[PDB]
Amino acid sequence: VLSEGEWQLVLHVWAKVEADVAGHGQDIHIRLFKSHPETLEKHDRFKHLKTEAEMKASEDLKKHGVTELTALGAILKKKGHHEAELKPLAQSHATKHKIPIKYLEFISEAIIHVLHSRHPGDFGADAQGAMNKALELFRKDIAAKYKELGYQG
Numbered sequence: 001v002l003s004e005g006e007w008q009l010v011l012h013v014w015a016k017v018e019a020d021v022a023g024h025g026q027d028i029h030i031r032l033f034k035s036h037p038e039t040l041e042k043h044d045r046f047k048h049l050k051t052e053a054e055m056k057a058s059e060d061l062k063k064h065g066v067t068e069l070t071a072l073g074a075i076l077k078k079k080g081h082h083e084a085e086l087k088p089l090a091q092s093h094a095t096k097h098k099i100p101i102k103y104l105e106f107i108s109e110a111i112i113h114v115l116h117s118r119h120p121g122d123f124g125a126d127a128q129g130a131m132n133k134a135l136e137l138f139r140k141d142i143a144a145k146y147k148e149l150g151y152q153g
């Protein structure tokens with residue numbers, strides 16, 4: 001459970017992400033795929049994107065990063081009260097896409113890397129700690145939902 005102060009820091013840096021959702025999504029995906037290359041295999045339509053310029057130029061990929069960050073932003077703004085927003089995401093991700101909790105941690109690492117890289121002055125220790133706690137709560141709750149649906153994380 002997060003403090004109101006913690007939620008404030010999460011939402012303060014989230015407002016900065018929202019000045020450029022699409023560029024943050026690109027950087028996050030580029031980082032994720034480079035760091036943890038197994039993750040690119042869940043994206044069949046992005047396989048031919050073999051260099052960083054090719055990744056940046058893909059409207060497909062760009063749009064997908066806005067779709068993911070939009071859903072994550074809406075979850076964050078509910079400050080933990082996110083069952084209604086979380087349930088459809090667990091359903092597609094447990095049953096259709098097959099995304100293990102470990103991959104959610106990898107992308108959580110990429111989000112934190114990119115928010116440090118772009119907003120170091122608004123992403124010091126206590127802000128990083130809050131964002132980590134928020135992402136941890138997201139992943140705890142999505143994993144409980146995965147198990148309800150019969151998917152083992």
Ligand code: ZNH
Pocket residue numbers: 039040042043064067068069071072088089092093097099103104107
């Ligand atoms: C933060 C975190 C996150 C978020 C919020 C998200 C969100 C999302 C959204 C909103 C969508 C659309 C709808 C549905 O459900 O389907 C998606 C999809 C999606 N998803 Zn995901 N995700 C994520 C992570 C992820 C990862 C990590 C992966 C891998 C690796 C993924 C993979 C995915 C896919 C594959 C899809 C489909 C796409 C297409 O196909 O178009 N995912 N996703």
